[PDB]
Design a protein around this ligand. Structure first.
Ligand SMILES: O=c1[nH]c(=O)c2nn[nH]c2[nH]1
Ligand SMILES: O=c1[nH]c(=O)c2nn[nH]c2[nH]1
Ligand SMILES: O=c1[nH]c(=O)c2nn[nH]c2[nH]1
Ligand SMILES: O=c1[nH]c(=O)c2nn[nH]c2[nH]1
Ligand SMILES: [Cl-]
Ligand SMILES: [Cl-]
Ligand SMILES: [Cl-]
Ligand SMILES: [Cl-]
Lengths: 294, 294, 294, 294
């Protein structure tokens, strides 16, 4: 391995081009993003065989300073004319490889920094503020992009993934976990009605990478919509396990978005202990990792 | 000082008596709490001169185990018939001092563990779920109560305070900070239009402690309403400083809620640096502490 | 309440004047600090009736910018000729009140950012490096100072306190907790031999505040010595409770340091659950608070 | 992907068999581990085609409860007769695959929970305590193991890696970063003498995975020794970049330990800003990733 880069490149932009013209689904009222306030946390990694001597000899001649990568990202958020974090990453990646010919590969991660609307009274009525926003520490959208320079100096995207991270959902009833193996290592009682509490990280990949950019917004899959599918399916389902639940969420996602190739889940179990009153469990947490494919 | 107790006593209760019959204000649509899911994090501290030898001699005869305090709190959440965290603390405090005659003082802190509603499609339409909730890591209500046993075994509340913690608000324009002292220690440029980003912790005290319990809900002051006042005032105000803003929020709170005696602010400045694009500042943060009284 | 200021003012200084000539005690090898690297996290709070209109009118005329306070602290670390965090706080406080006549009160907290020595080899001989240090996230020294301007314009230290924070000690055997109250709320079994795990925060006050500055190092009480006293007493004692333990630690501190007036403890219980193998408990933690006086 | 398991399985064992007979090197005083206290944080992931219906049909028949996996790990720590985290992972993995024939693959991560020795005095003499230990939140050893069941029912380790995580080192002088690319995105000044502050995560792989277990202790590579090599090389080197430094650390490690096949570095740059006094930078951090092979 041989890479270097910059992490935690925060950048906040006001009045990005709004996202509109999206295609709706029954589970979600989502109809676009105002983009009055747009924040992203970017990580950039770069590689290339010409970087070897920066390690083996301490030769910095071909080293783009990581501070300069930070400047690069922040400047490009100012000039970005698109509507999605996915499109922003492509803009940065393409621009970076065009600028720095000795770099052979670039990886980017972008995490939304979410803000929520607030309300204010003005001119006699209470309404959504166009000025004041609440920083949210709950779920957030993510995007990943990897781009390579080929021998002929053409650029190719080699991997793209979008996601939703930090979703924490508890369903107070209508969940069971029974029928599991009962042997000499088992002390967990069967439970026909538990308040299942899951952490969900959901990632999806498009059949066609272009659909991720938002340039034809009707083909874009919004994290907001994925969130609403997850909550609806959780509500609808008499769950038999977390495994059972996330398969069903995945199937619904792929049904609602035929342009997707696959969905990947990372879930954690944080269900409370019963002492109706419950309390926090000991630290160990179950987890599940599962891919659903078209 | 001589106290001991238990912290991080999480307790989650389903179907607490709903809070309704509240008195509305223009800034807030708040009309009550469903209490399908009610979570609280309690810290309990107890004192009394009869605890001395548990320190000086290692004599545990009069020691209520802190583990037993945790059991006490969780059991009382199960039996609580009221509608507010403030009332829960009074219930716990009175009960504890009645049980344990050698304890002279008890302090309680209760922090709301907030959950947000989610949507689900059932029977043809999308509607708020009565089963699935989203755990929120954003702002949360707080309550504080101290109670003492007098010589005649009567119990008195000696301090009560309610609050709202973890409110993080950014206003993208309509904020200035100019005219401050410019001397040999000053490098901060004057700024006629900054995206002021404040953390707010707001605490209020009632003229009549009975009003905090929710037994006559029309006299209760809800953290939700306080939150909505803060966002409204922030929006309305061409801020001149954080100091200026929190005084105005305080004045409005006291105007809307004549039954309050005072409001106390702890604010922090987390305003982004301009590189329109902004980024995270260095770690040092400004803060302000201010009390507004009727 | 009416204060404002700056928190998380990190400042790192190289080659501070070394602390030397400290009176040693049996429990500790500590004799001083080389101060090749000296890190502090400072919080400054200031008050004064002349600050009122900065809140009530948005008048910034007598506002020292919190950014400027940060500059003030960092510039004074560069000029500081003393040898302790306690002395540094006094230097900053006195200087600030001398500079800004409209300020009546200043409160300072200083937390050590600790660094540990590392090994390097020269001529086949391994010894402590004078260049490379390890940043520690374990225990750290603290200092507190409050200074006020009197009506006759004299300056007075109204409160001073030193401390040790973040000490986490586990004793694998030789600890009991038995004989506590057993009633309807008690589920905790008696334990004649538990691996007591305590978090300790220890704070001391001097009879004479001048002794805290270290200008006469024979009278200075180092956090390192307090640490070594705590571990020695823990080792020596068949503990009967945390309450029992911290009283004995306090007595030993006051015996070793007659120049101290009091020692104040804040302890927490994080003892593992037994399944010899143990595991982490549920989140609730016991705590104790106790002052021992000379 | 199709896996599930348990994370944050903390387990603390007293009086594990001591690690003895480790070959000492000039950079380090390390000669073994007393293992009076032995703490590990384990993550277990398992897979197999037969787990499919637990996802697709909600069939729990072949589900080992994640709670049971926790029980399995903790019971095996109790019976483990070896001397290393690496060996413990092998013990758990082999045991688990022997028990559960429907499981085709198991991945294990083990992270040391480190404790440090403390001092105690008896009859006027200070020595290391055999009873009281200090929990450390600084650097810690890691181990990774992946094991699979083949078609002929033999078991095979497919991946093994050891490591040192959480090392934070600052060298106060003797570091430069100059000669990097200066173009339209470069604002970083060259620095001929910076107080380079690096976070290091170092991982190594053995030529023979058997050497990782410690059964032949002369071939075991201790994380403590890797730490002391890293600090020695940092001290000795006039660093030209972090890239330059980690290459040299890697080369020294492979020189000292011919039984190793590779060393992999993940570093981060956290160097302070100069205001001699320095302060914390803005959040963005540089990072470097490099593999040195034998
Ligand atoms: O949904 C669940 N899946 C599991 O694998 C499991 N194991 N314990 N509890 C569990 N719950
Ligand atoms: O609102 C503000 N108040 C202050 O006191 C201050 N100081 N620097 N910036 C500031 N902003
Ligand atoms: O040392 C202890 N003190 C206490 O007060 C306590 N309560 N539960 N366990 C305890 N241990
Ligand atoms: O050691 C460094 N490597 C880098 O790549 C770099 N970029 N900015 N500063 C840096 N320092
Ligand atoms: Cl689970
Ligand atoms: Cl400020
Ligand atoms: Cl306790
Ligand atoms: Cl860097």
């Amino acid at each position: 391995v041989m890479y270097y880069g910059k992490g935690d490149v925060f950048a906040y932009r006001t009045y990005l081009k709004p996202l509109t013209g999206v295609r709706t689904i029954p589970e979600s009222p989502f109809s676009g993003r105002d983009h009055i306030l747009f924040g992203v946390n970017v990580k950039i990694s770069v590689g290339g065989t010409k970087l070897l001597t920066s390690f083996t000899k301490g030769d910095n001649s071909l080293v783009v300073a990581t501070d300069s990568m930070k400047n690069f990202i922040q400047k490009h958020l100012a000039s970005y004319t698109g509507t999605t974090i996915e499109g922003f990453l492509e803009y940065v990646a393409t621009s970076f490889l065009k600028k720095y010919s000795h770099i052979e590969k670039i990886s980017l991660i972008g995490e939304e920094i979410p803000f929520e609307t607030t309300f204010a009274v003005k001119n006699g009525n209470r309404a959504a503020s166009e000025l004041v926003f609440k920083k949210s520490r709950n779920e957030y959208a993510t995007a990943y992009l990897n781009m390579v320079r080929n021998e002929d100096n053409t650029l190719n995207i080699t991997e793209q993934q979008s996601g939703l991270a930090g979703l924490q959902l508890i369903k107070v009833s209508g969940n069971s976990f029974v029928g599991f193996i009962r042997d000499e290592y088992t002390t967990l009682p069967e439970d026909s009605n538990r308040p299942l509490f899951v952490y969900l990280n959901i990632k999806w990949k498009y059949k066609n990478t272009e659909d991720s950019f938002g340039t034809n917004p009707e083909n874009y899959v919004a994290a907001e919509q994925i969130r609403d599918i997850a909550t609806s399916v959780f509500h609808e389902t008499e769950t038999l396990s977390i495994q059972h639940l996330i398969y069903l969420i995945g199937r619904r996602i792929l049904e609602r978005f035929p342009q997707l190739q696959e969905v990947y889940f990372e879930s954690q179990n944080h269900t409370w202990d019963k002492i109706k009153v419950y309390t926090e469990p000991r630290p160990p947490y179950g987890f599940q990792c599962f891919t659903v494919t078209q």
